[PDB]
Each structure stands twice: as C-alpha cells, then as structure tokens.
From a paper:
One family of transcription factors in mammals is known as the [name]-[name] family, which consists of sixteen members including [name] and [name]. Proteins in the [name]-[name] family have to form pairs in order to bind to DNA: [name] and [name] both interact with another [name]-[name] protein called [name], but it is not clear exactly how this works. We employed the contiguous [name]-[name]-A-[name]-B segments of [name], [name] and [name] proteins for our crystallographic studies.
We could not obtain crystals of apo [name]-[name] and instead pursued its DNA complex. The response element for [name]-[name] is known to match the consensus hypoxia response element ([name]), but the response element for [name]-[name] was not previously characterized. [name] and [name] closely share amino-acids within their [name] domain (75% identity), including conservation of residues that recognize DNA base-pairs based on our observations of the HIF-2α-[name]-DNA complex. We measured the dissociation constants (Kd) using a DNA duplex containing a central [name] sequence (5’-TACGTG-3’) and found similar Kd values of ~20 nM for both [name]-[name] and [name]-[name]. We then obtained crystals for [name]-[name] bound to this [name] element and solved the structure at 4.2 Å resolution. The resolution made possible an architectural comparison, at the quaternary level, between the [name]-[name], [name]-[name], HIF-1α-[name] and HIF-2α-[name] heterodimers. All of these complexes share a similar overall architecture stabilized by the same six domain-domain junctions (see below). Furthermore, the cooperation between the two subunits of [name]-[name] also creates a DNA-reading head that is similar to that of the HIF-α-[name]-DNA complexes, allowing direct readout of the [name] site. Similarly positioned pockets are seen in the [name] protein, measuring 100 Å3 and 230 Å3, respectively.
Numbering used by the authors:
A (entry chain A): 89 to 142, 156 to 228, 259 to 271, 291 to 311, 337 to 349, 362 to 463
B (entry chain B): 59 to 118, 148 to 217, 264 to 276, 287 to 298, 314 to 324, 336 to 420, 429 to 453
The structure:
DNA sequence: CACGACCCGCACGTACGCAGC
DNA sequence: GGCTGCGTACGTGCGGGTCGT
C-alpha cells in the first residue's frame, strides 16, 4: 500500500517539477528567444545568470504604488500631541488632490473635517496600534450627495502604530425613493421629492399614494400595490399621473417591491422608486 | 555501462543542487531563510518574483524612509497580496502570518483557490473574471477558516489589501436584525436612547436608498458568519440621518459594532413616518 | 522525548530515447 | 545494425520530518 502510493507521489513530483522548469523556461527571455528547448541545467544556469542581473520581493516604490492601486493608500506620520504632519508620501496626490507641500509641515487637525477633530484628538493621546475613520479635505467627496460648490471630504480609513496608512474605501459611498406599508401609506419620503414633485416630505407622510393619484389611474395603483404585495421580492413598475404641489399632472413611473427580511422573511415595507 | 552512469549522474545531480541553492541564496529574502530552503519552494519563489516584476512594470527625513516597507506593512491591520490573470499569488507580505498563520514562502506561487474555503471559489473566480473590487471570503486560518475582507483593484490580475475579523457603540440584535440590546452611549451620538430602538429591527431605521446595500451585507453575514457594511445612513427620530459603518458578527446573537462617521445631517425635513 | 505511527522529501541507481566518428 | 556521450523518466530505499493515544 506504500509502493504504489509512493511511485505515484514521485510521478506527481516529476510532472510538477518539470512543469516549474518549463514554466520558468519561457520566463527568462534567454530561453524564450532561443531556437529550441535547452538543457535543464543550462536552462537554470541562464536563470541564475539573468536573476543575478537585478521588504520582500517588492521595492519601496513598487510597494508604495501597489498600496496606492490597491486601495488609494498613502503613508503619513504626524506628532502624537501637536498633530504636526512630519511626513507624508506623495501618494496623497492621487488620493486627495493635495500637493505634497500643502500636507508636509501642517497639522492633521487642520486637514480633517472640523467635526472630525474630536475623534482625531482622541487619537493623539494616552490615559501600540491605531485605527480610525475620518473625513479629509480634497482640494486642487465620498459621504453623501455632493453639495453645491462646497469642499470635498473623503472617508479615509487610517491604520498604524503615529505612523499610519490612510486608505480610501471607495466601494461604500453611494426621482426619489419612498417606503409604504402594505396599505400604501407613505412611511418614508426621501428629500428629492421636493425637486421631483414639489411637496415637502412631511406633506406626503402618513398619507396614501392613491390620494395623490389621478382618479382614472387610482384603481390601477391599488391593483399594482396589491400585486407587489403578492409578488414577494419581485419588482413591479407602474406609470401613473401624479398631482404635484403646483397644480399639474406629471407622468410618473414607479417601480416597487416588498422588502422581505433576509432572515425572518417578514414584510418590512414596500420600497418605491418614483421617477418622472 | 552503469559506473559511468553512477558517477556521471551523481555529477549532474551535483551541478543541479549547486545551481538550486545559489539561486535560492540570491532571493529577496534574508540569508537566514533563503539559505536553508525547500527545493521546490525555491522555484515557486523565483517564478513568482519574475512574474511579479513583469506584473509591476507592465502597468500604470531618512529614518521614516529607510523602514518604508516595515512601516507600511506593520501599520496595516491586514496583509497585502498581488495575484495574476490565473489566480497565482505573485506576492504576499509576510504579515499574513499574523492573521492567518500562513507562511509567506508557502503562499508565494500557489493558486489563491488552494487557500480559500471551497464553496466560495466560484465567487472569487467570478471576481477575477475566470473595476474596483470588494468582497468577503473564507481563508485557511491555522490558529478552521477566517472571514477575510478584501478590497482592491483588478487591472489580468487582482491586487488586494485584506484584513481579518474576530466614537462607536455596540448593539445586540437577532438574526433578522431586531435590536436586542444596546449600549447607553448612543445618546452621545443619536436622538434616541436604547429603548426607542429596541423591539423594532434595523430596517425601520436605514435610509431607504441604502436598504439594498444593508440587505446584501445581511446576506453575506448570514452565509459566512461575519460582515462589514457600507457607509450607510441611520435616520434620527426628528429628521435626517447620521452616517454609520458596522462590523457585524454571529453565533446565536448578532453583534453590530457601529463606527460613527458624521454628525446629524439635514435634521429639519422628516424622511420616515417614525419622524412624525 | 519517546515510539512506531507514518508522510514527505531526496537521491540513488537504472532503464529507455537520440546524437555521432 | 555495433557502443558510447548525453538527458529525461521510473521506481524504490533511506534519513529527516509530525502526529497521536
């Protein structure tokens, strides 16, 4: 039971090994430009020759750039009492749009969001590792709809021991959306309605959507709502007339579905996406 | 006949072994482990080194610099690695040995699929195509799997920073995200106190444009045991919302670690009916 | 730190496939 | 076709490895 197991283990080792040999053959360009396949020995002599021709595997540059491509990460070092940025890597430029000179010498308190100073303060103290989340200024955003001509504060993830890598987590920063009960009562109205239908959100809340519907499409609205109740998580869209807060009938497509809890599977509400 | 074969073949094995161990000696690892090293792991490392340099150069005051590598690497709360168009680790920092117990020499060269939990294979083969990247997997931890969260970008080859899992407050909730327990400290940051949130579930409080994302995170939590949500908006009792990011685990009571991100934005207009 | 329990690596010896005076 | 330089593939035997009750 050990002779065959072992002869086949060794065969596996020969296929494997010679596969490393032939795989490395077309790596070192000496063997990939040559006419025919060389001697194994001479192959790996070429390999050590061309390998000698050149902190593990990667240089400081390649590991910096790899942190940057990886997750928008840049190194910085500040003081643990003052906040004086005594070092920053140049990766800050393709991360925040700050020149390296506006960041070197200044304070981290001065670079974060005014509200994000307290927590930042709670970082430069005592009474060892560190990791926190803080907004930072862009210059020349990732936390909410971009405001009208305001500065841009990203959400930087800071780790370190103060020596820190600050990395962006881009995959997290995200007509008008609403919620309803199974009777179609507005249980939520996103603010976009103000510019979408004109009302204020409280001016819809508590009320039924069929109230704002055209008397000729209301029955359709009810049958549809009952249907998305009866479709489970399946989506259903309907186009109807909506009486805005200015005396006008806007044609409005709204897709909606019921939100069934991923665990208990209960109806939380019905989500509407009301678009003109 | 064979005497010539005995000593001639022993000579060939001699030349062989000498080439192998000098090739090993030149590796970017210190003399300590590059000296006494496995014979096949030699060609693993060399192959992944040429593959990784090709990988890097085919794509787009004195102290804080001399230890650039160890500062970047030991500042991050995870390990950083680079794959290729096939899945082979073309690089991985030594620091992975901290969080998974895996040897850098052992992982450099092997297919990533070898060290990820099966059943989550086709997810990752999906994610490498087999431009941003962000997902949860399960990796062989020898300290029998860890929930590894990875973020990175895909260039033909992925590049990833990854971290492990076991101005903030903790909530205990059921599996359906029904708030069971809650710390008092929420009155620090939010309008309600641990009684007017307990009883109802998380979904009556998420901003209705995020409920999609939080739903997906609920799924991933459910199937893999751990999760981190995206930057979302938790509505306040009076109006608006505040930004939260939660590290959540199971095994069964969900614990929901809410990292605070911002103050109450847009506190006038009411969104939900729970704000009237 | 034992002990067969092995498993895995390693090299050894040899057997089969190709050049050529 | 003799037989030798030259090289890769096969199988097994040995010494250094890690578990387990």
């Amino acid at each position: 039971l050990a002779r065959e197991n072992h002869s086949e283990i060794e065969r596996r080792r020969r296929n494997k090994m010679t596969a490393y040999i032939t795989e490395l053959s077309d790596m070192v360009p000496t063997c990939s430009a040559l006419a025919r396949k060389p001697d194994k020995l001479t192959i790996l002599r070429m390999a050590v020759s061309h390998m000698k021709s050149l902190p593990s595997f990667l240089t400081d540059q390649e590991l910096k750039h790899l942190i940057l491509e990886a997750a928008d990460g840049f190194l910085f070092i500040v003081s643990c009492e003052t906040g004086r940025v005594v070092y920053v890597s140049d990766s800050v430029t393709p991360v925040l749009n700050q020149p390296q000179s506006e960041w070197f010498g200044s304070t981290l308190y001065d670079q974060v969001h005014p509200d994000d100073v307290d927590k930042l303060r709670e970082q430069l103290s005592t009474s060892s590792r560190r990791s926190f989340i803080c907004r930072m200024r862009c210059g020349t955003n990732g936390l909410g709809s971009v405001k009208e001509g305001e500065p841009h504060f990203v959400v930087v993830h800071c780790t370190g021991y103060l020596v820190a890598i600050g990395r962006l987590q881009v995959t997290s920063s995200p007509e008008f959306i609403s919620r309803h009960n199974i009777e179609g009562i507005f249980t939520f109205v996103d603010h976009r309605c103000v510019a979408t239908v004109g009302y204020q959100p409280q001016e819809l809340l508590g009320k039924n959507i069929v109230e704002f519907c055209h008397p000729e499409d209301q029955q359709l609205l009810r049958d549809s709502f009952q249907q998305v109740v009866k479709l489970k998580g399946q989506v259903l869209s309907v186009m109807f007339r909506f009486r805005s807060k200015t005396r006008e009938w806007l044609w409005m497509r709204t897709s909606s579905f019921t939100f069934q809890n991923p665990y208990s599977d209960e109806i939380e509400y019905i989500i509407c996406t009301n678009t003109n | 006949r064979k005497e010539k074969s005995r000593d001639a073949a022993r000579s060939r094995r001699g030349k062989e072994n000498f080439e192998f161990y000098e090739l090993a000696k030149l590796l970017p690892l210190p003399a300590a482990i590059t000296s006494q090293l496995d014979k096949a792991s030699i060609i693993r490392l060399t192959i992944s080194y040429l593959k990784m340099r090709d990988f890097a150069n085919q794509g787009d005051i004195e102290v804080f610099e001399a230890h650039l590598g160890s500062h970047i690497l030991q500042s991050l709360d995870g390990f950083v690695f680079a794959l290729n168009q096939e899945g082979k680790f073309l690089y991985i920092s030594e620091t992975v040995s901290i969080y998974l117990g895996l040897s850098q020499v052992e992982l450099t060269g092997s297919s990533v699929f070898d060290y990820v939990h099966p059943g989550d294979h086709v997810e990752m083969a999906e994610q490498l195509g087999m431009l941003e990247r962000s997902f949860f997997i399960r990796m062989k931890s020898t300290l029998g799997y860890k929930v590894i969260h990875i973020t990175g970008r895909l260039r033909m080859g992925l590049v990833v920073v990854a971290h492990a899992l076991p101005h903030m407050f903790v909530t205990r909730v059921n599996m359906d995200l029904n708030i069971i327990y809650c710390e008092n400290r929420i009155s620090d940051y939010m309008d309600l106190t641990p009684v007017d949130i307990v009883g109802k579930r998380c979904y009556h409080f998420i901003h209705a444009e995020d409920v999609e994302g939080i739903r997906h995170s609920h799924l991933d939590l459910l199937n893999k045991g751990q999760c981190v949500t995206k930057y979302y908006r938790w509505m306040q009792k009076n109006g608006g919302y505040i930004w939260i990011q939660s590290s959540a685990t199971i095994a069964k009571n969900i614990i929901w670690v809410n990292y605070l991100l911002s103050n109450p934005e847009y506190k006038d207009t009411p969104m939900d009916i729970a704000q009237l």
